Amino acid sequence: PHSHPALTPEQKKELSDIAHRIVAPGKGILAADESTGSIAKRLQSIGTENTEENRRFYRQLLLTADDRVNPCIGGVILFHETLYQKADDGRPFPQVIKSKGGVVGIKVDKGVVPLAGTNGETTTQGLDGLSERCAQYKKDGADFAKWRCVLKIGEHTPSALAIMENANVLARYASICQQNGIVPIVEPEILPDGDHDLKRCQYVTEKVLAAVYKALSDHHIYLEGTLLKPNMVTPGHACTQKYSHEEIAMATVTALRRTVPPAVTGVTFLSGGQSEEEASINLNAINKCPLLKPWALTFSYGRALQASALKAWGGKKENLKAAQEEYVKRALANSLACQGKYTPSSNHAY
Amino acid sequence: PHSHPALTPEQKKELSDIAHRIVAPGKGILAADESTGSIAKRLQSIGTENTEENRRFYRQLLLTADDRVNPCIGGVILFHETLYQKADDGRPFPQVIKSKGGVVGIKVDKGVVPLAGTNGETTTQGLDGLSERCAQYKKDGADFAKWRCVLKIGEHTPSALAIMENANVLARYASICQQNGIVPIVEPEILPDGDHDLKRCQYVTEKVLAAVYKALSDHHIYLEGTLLKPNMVTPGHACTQKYSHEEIAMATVTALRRTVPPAVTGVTFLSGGQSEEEASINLNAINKCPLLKPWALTFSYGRALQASALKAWGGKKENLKAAQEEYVKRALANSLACQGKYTPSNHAY
Amino acid sequence: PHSHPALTPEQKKELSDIAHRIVAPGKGILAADESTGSIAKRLQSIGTENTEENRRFYRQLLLTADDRVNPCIGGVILFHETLYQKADDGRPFPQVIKSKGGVVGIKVDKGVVPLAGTNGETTTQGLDGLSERCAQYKKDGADFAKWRCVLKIGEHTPSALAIMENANVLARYASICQQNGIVPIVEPEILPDGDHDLKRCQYVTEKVLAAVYKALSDHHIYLEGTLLKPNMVTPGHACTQKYSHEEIAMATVTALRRTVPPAVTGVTFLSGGQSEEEASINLNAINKCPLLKPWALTFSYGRALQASALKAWGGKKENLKAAQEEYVKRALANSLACQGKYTPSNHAY
Amino acid sequence: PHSHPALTPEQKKELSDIAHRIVAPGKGILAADESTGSIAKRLQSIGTENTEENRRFYRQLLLTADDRVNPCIGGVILFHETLYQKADDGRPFPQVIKSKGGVVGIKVDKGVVPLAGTNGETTTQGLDGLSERCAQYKKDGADFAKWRCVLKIGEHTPSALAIMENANVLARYASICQQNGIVPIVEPEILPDGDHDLKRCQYVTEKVLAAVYKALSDHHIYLEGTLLKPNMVTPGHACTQKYSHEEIAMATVTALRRTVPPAVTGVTFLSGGQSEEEASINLNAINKCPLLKPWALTFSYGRALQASALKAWGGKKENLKAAQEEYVKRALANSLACQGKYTPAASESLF
Ligand SMILES: CO[C@H](COP(=O)(O)O)[C@@H](O)[C@H](O)[C@H](O)COP(=O)(O)O
Ligand SMILES: CO[C@H](COP(=O)(O)O)[C@@H](O)[C@H](O)[C@H](O)COP(=O)(O)O
Ligand SMILES: CO[C@H](COP(=O)(O)O)[C@@H](O)[C@H](O)[C@H](O)COP(=O)(O)O
Ligand SMILES: CO[C@H](COP(=O)(O)O)[C@@H](O)[C@H](O)[C@H](O)COP(=O)(O)O
């Protein structure tokens, strides 16, 4: 049990400062890091061709929204392509993001792959050459990263293997990021697919998060220089029992309180399949939950920040301003929610 | 994995209420749970015979001190024998304690045993018939329990085996306690023995508590109905490098923040080989640390509540008052300490 | 990872020597180690009262059967009470067993306890004071021990927790036994309860045994000085599908080949509710299975050695010889079975 | 837990048949899978330039030695480049290997990388797109693969982290291979660097192998369709105490017996820094060791099959035959060793 410090005091300070800036009071993260394949699905749903120019234009649309988003957006997550694209005025997109007060983030995973011998479970690849990629990304303006693991609640899932293997790969990814001055966002996503109830989600979330933080400990991860991107605890999409937002909040915050060490700087929730308003209301309820919550509780939203903007845009340039207006409004809503100031205007049961 | 609830909401509420009572603001725990062989050592240091009557009398002395300890003392841990002894007025000791505002605790472990294949490391025994014992203890007035694992920082210790095994047995004990409405105090003590510096203790303490909480999770422990009893993070006893109390506090609070889930109701530090004054100054510094601390940080002191009481007693019936006075002074000192009201680059941690 | 040898070369030689004697070619184990409440059930099944004297007599009946059993029986497992009883002629039962060429064994667990938050799963207790017990048992003539863990195949079982905790307590027991010159028989019994098929049993058996052997390594267990007592791999009791003895044998030996290091001296199957004949026929098929089998494959039978003897006895002293005759025939049959001499597409596994 | 078979009976049969073929009696493996950067250091030691043609030529030299090697060589491991190279007669190197009765193997790892927070310890990278790479390698003639993890004996190493992480990634790699009809050789190398003694190496080897097989079990690996490639148990290179070959063999076979399940089809030892003769004598002692050994015990040698052949070649075209003769000699020596029938540059330490 001997210490061979992974990081010097100077490196730790850098990572903690980055993580805190990202989730500073009022702020959250725009997840605009959809891969070519995944954003294709997005463009297809508004009858728009999947071209590099259309992708650049749409990302530009979000990133150059007016300065009302500035106090709302602490970080933006980009896909590799977008990190090296430019606004119309010649400015690299990372420069655009920084000029508006946002930290630049990069998605570094290479997608999920099947775990043999399991019931449709996966782990995530992307470790190969990751240190070199992170050194390069750091040099080109990124200060944090994202890696997404995916788990499913079902009859025999998540299995012990899936839990252990996904926690392990997350820790390796985190270790490599921190060696290169990159703050890792750890995403152990538990899908909402299925008809399980709220407490089954809460139980699995608690088990998954316990495994994640044990792996991070084993791999010597500096928690203060990390963020967590979990699912909210919710019933399954097909569950018949209804729950209030207060119950979703309580279950979510209880699960986190039981597993997430206080040294973690912030929890940036994924929105999953939730509508824009639903995601905002839940995040707001979570921040109003009367329990002690010793980490920032904010958003890292893809769909829940973009759904309307993508719609209003319809792939037509003249709609640019109305689409940006849709984004800014969700940005404002979620900035309020991550402070518990959003208005549409028995713990032991957990 | 599928849920098969260990506890009902009503069982959870009971355990949570107990844990919060013990560590309510300004309160800590008196650890008077020395076994026969251990208390023998105490009495020996004051030239006093180790008879049941002297044990009964010494405990009486501590437990019936005046009402100025009432707000200082949320809990009192007893050894089996004492739980069934009575004060001079005929009242069972559990009743004395309860009448003064205290929750009754019972140590239930049966001591350390060697782990073979290790360099002098141990685990702790005491699981056998534990459930039946707990049911009886509960019936006879106890609401919490204590179990002590011991780890040591050395050349090749604590080993992975020692960490894994002590964490696992602590989880088994916590689980059984909770099934019987007893709040388990989880004590994974890392000894201060040796010449290691402060950061090595911080490193080992962080690794140990990560293991403890993973094990508590695997065993479905309800954290809200548990307390943690760790060593403070300090340099080894023979460490040549010196540190301030503020550094001790920072290393300690940082270790806990990196491992102890917010759901844990309280952390009740053991005093180790710290003097009465040192133990209070450090607990005060810890509570003054500038970080967020989402659990009570208070005391479960044995020696550091008793050193001066014992010496002033000296084994003489007629020194009762002066001895009870020394105990009350340490109780008052530590009550202020766990509130940060006692006067006698964190990225580097 | 540094070695701090658990055992000297001399301690190893002793343990290995004992292990090999117990499972010498043709030899198996009589499990007569039913606890008071377990033998009670057995006695009620023949309307016989559970008194110490009837237990003594029944155990005497088995232990003093004629010398035809000597080449058959390498070891006899006893419950504590029986280790300290005497035959009619005054000879301690251990002396009896040993004059007939057998090694004396002692069951040292204290039964299963419930694991909270599981679907009816258990672990096993009995570690407290185990070292002191083993040294006394060794002094009083025992050279090996037995410890039973119990796992169940069901919807959510055996869980990760059940598998990890039972592997772990098995390793602790093994470590303590070996410190005291006692060969531990490691028994992780997977019950045949339920309607699961043969491949499900095989799968759960492989997962359980992998966990067991990893735990034994973590705790520095000297495998040459151990024996394994697993279930055979068979369909569940309620399973509607039919299998031949050859498929049971193939599944069992395949399971063992994938998990049990060659260093293990022997595998002594529990009978697990199989009839006497079925248990013998399966062991026989296991020993004829054409795959490489680098450990002795033999028996540690309770019911499959006793059922007919207990029936022929029916609690009447005068049925002594008819009773013993039934036991001797099962001893003979099983000694032949563990030699593959008893007569009353591996990639599919 | 519930079963969702990773493999069908048909797939198991194929993987089992491949594994048994590689380590059939008398047969071992030639490890010719040095990456560009490693073969370069090989060529440097003989003033030969590191060019594609020199590498191609040297590999041809080994693969086309006369037919005396056919019964000695059950498998040949190649680096990616070599897999798609051809001999002078236009035949792809895999065709050459098969025509001489050998199975074709492909190294698929992408080298070691540092584990942060450790004392100089590594894990191994190479899982990204491994499935796709394996499917392609299968199509192009390869039936097994090799992946190398590296561990080091020292004061604080191997650490719990290094052991777990390396065993886990080995399991991931084994799993992906088997999904694509490729037999994975699992190589958990414990370096002989340092001055530790025999029993320390034996202890570390037992611990590392227990972890590797637990990982493989957790990841549902089919052991009959794997091979293991461990270090032999030996004292450290700087250890002053001396041991006989019988002792090395005993410690090696004991360590294996305590950790490697009988289902594993074979154990193909790495030579490490052992001389060509040292590697053959030890391998021979191991097979003569009077304990029960339920797996084939053979070789997967790089340096210990190639040292003399490299030196005799010297990069000169005209030394073709002289080189091949040195290789054939080591191959025959080792085919006998892995049967326990072997009796004695081939003496120079290759550390
Ligand atoms: C679409 O974004 C990611 C999934 O697709 P790719 O990995 O192929 O790009 C995914 O990481 C996403 O960014 C996160 O899950 C957060 O998004 P939501 O807030 O919509 O759940
Ligand atoms: C004080 O009681 C204990 C002494 O050992 P025994 O278990 O034989 O009675 C011990 O548990 C003590 O409570 C501490 O854990 C160690 O010393 P401190 O209480 O001063 O910290
Ligand atoms: C002899 O029977 C034993 C009874 O166990 P308990 O006293 O703890 O209830 C039994 O454990 C036996 O030792 C083995 O399990 C094998 O017995 P069977 O061959 O009948 O399955
Ligand atoms: C140890 O690895 C294999 C056996 O080598 P030795 O028998 O000489 O010890 C071998 O295949 C080795 O991995 C390659 O020669 C070199 O691999 P890299 O290309 O990763 O450096």
Side-chain angles (χ1 to χ4, degrees), chain C residues 18-309:
Chain C
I18 295 168
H20 281 87
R21 289 209 284 280
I22 297 169
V23 301
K27 304 197 189 190
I29 296 168
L30 163 71
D33 64 298
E34 299 92 345
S35 55
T36 322
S38 181
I39 193 73
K41 287 299 308 188
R42 237 108 313 187
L43 288 178
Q44 274 286 66
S45 83
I46 50 167
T48 304
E49 213 206 322
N50 191 27
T51 71
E52 155 160 27
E53 173 55 22
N54 287 332
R55 298 190 293 267
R56 191 198 66 85
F57 187 88
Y58 178 60
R59 269 62 185 269
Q60 173 169 265
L61 177 165
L62 297 172
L63 293 184
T64 63
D66 70 79
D67 294 324
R68 279 176 300 169
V69 310
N70 296 18
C72 297
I73 303 302
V76 178
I77 320 184
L78 302 179
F79 176 74
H80 176 111
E81 175 189 274
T82 318
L83 189 79
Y84 295 104
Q85 282 174 342
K86 291 164 166 170
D88 294 327
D89 65 5
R91 288 188 297 157
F93 284 151
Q95 188 184 321
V96 173
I97 290 150
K98 284 162 158 192
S99 62
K100 300 172 60 74
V103 179
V104 180
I106 180 61
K107 182 247 291 305
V108 301
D109 72 77
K110 301 194 178 218
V112 302
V113 290
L115 284 169
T118 68
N119 191 9
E121 295 180 294
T122 65
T123 194
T124 296
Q125 65 168 9
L127 299 176
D128 294 350
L130 184 57
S131 192
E132 289 71 22
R133 290 177 65 211
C134 285
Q136 183 71 45
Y137 289 143
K138 178 80 170 167
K139 190 165 171 167
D140 296 342
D143 283 316
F144 73 102
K146 170 272 189 113
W147 177 292
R148 178 171 187 248
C149 285
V150 179
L151 299 170
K152 195 172 207 169
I153 300 181
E155 184 77 332
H156 298 164
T157 67
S159 56
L161 174 63
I163 293 171
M164 179 275 296
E165 157 56 31
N166 283 267
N168 196 70
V169 72
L170 282 168
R172 288 288 298 119
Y173 139 83
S175 177
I176 291 166
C177 284
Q178 294 195 320
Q179 281 306 292
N180 287 282
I182 299 283
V183 169
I185 295 179
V186 172
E187 180 185 357
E189 170 171 11
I190 300 166
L191 294 176
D193 292 31
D195 62 17
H196 59 274
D197 57 19
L198 187 67
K199 57 173 155 56
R200 173 122 157 96
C201 188
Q202 184 180 329
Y203 177 92
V204 172
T205 294
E206 293 174 4
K207 291 335 190 195
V208 161
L209 291 181
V212 165
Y213 282 101
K214 177 54 155 70
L216 292 187
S217 168
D218 290 351
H219 288 251
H220 314 295
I221 303 309
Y222 172 66
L223 293 181
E224 288 85 338
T226 73
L227 303 168
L228 180 64
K229 179 160 168 172
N231 51 282
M232 303 180 178
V233 180
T234 78
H237 268 320
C239 177
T240 65
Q241 181 165 350
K242 304 290 131 136
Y243 299 83
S244 68
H245 302 285
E246 286 69 42
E247 297 178 302
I248 283 157
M250 177 61 53
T252 292
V253 168
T254 293
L256 293 171
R257 280 175 42 84
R258 293 175 173 171
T259 58
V260 188
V264 172
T265 295
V267 175
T268 65
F269 296 102
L270 57 94
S271 58
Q274 300 171 59
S275 59
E276 297 168 307
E277 200 59 52
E278 185 191 8
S280 299
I281 284 172
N282 281 332
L283 182 54
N284 189 69
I286 281 154
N287 275 277
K288 298 179 75 197
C289 190
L291 310 169
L292 204 160
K293 300 174 302 296
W295 351 253
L297 296 162
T298 194
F299 57 95
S300 184
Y301 288 169
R303 295 164 280 188
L305 271 173
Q306 298 184 50
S308 284

Side-chain angles (χ1 to χ4, degrees), chain C residues 1-3 154-155 158 200 203-204 207 210-211 214 217 220 222-224 257-258 260-263 292 294-295 347 349, chain D residues 1-3 9 12-13 16 154-155 157-158 200 203 207 210 214 217 220 222-224 257-258 260-263 292 294:
Chain C
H2 296 259
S3 181
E155 184 77 332
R200 173 122 157 96
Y203 177 92
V204 172
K207 291 335 190 195
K214 177 54 155 70
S217 168
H220 314 295
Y222 172 66
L223 293 181
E224 288 85 338
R257 280 175 42 84
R258 293 175 173 171
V260 188
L292 204 160
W295 351 253
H347 303 118
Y349 301 70
Chain D
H2 283 266
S3 185
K12 285 173 181 180
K13 190 197 191 310
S16 180
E155 188 83 305
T157 67
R200 172 139 173 76
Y203 182 86
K207 293 334 190 189
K214 186 47 168 57
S217 171
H220 313 302
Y222 175 57
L223 301 183
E224 291 91 328
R257 273 172 51 79
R258 287 169 181 175
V260 181
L292 194 165

Side-chain angles (χ1 to χ4, degrees), chain D residues 180-252:
Chain D
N180 289 274
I182 299 301
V183 166
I185 292 172
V186 169
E187 188 186 343
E189 194 188 344
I190 307 166
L191 296 176
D193 300 45
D195 61 16
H196 53 279
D197 65 5
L198 185 66
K199 83 188 123 87
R200 172 139 173 76
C201 177
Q202 184 177 334
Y203 182 86
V204 171
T205 296
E206 292 173 3
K207 293 334 190 189
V208 161
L209 291 183
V212 165
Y213 285 100
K214 186 47 168 57
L216 295 184
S217 171
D218 290 354
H219 287 254
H220 313 302
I221 307 301
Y222 175 57
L223 301 183
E224 291 91 328
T226 70
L227 300 182
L228 177 73
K229 174 164 178 171
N231 49 288
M232 302 185 182
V233 176
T234 74
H237 185 251
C239 179
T240 63
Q241 183 171 352
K242 301 286 149 169
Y243 301 79
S244 72
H245 302 296
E246 288 68 46
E247 291 176 308
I248 282 167
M250 179 55 73
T252 293

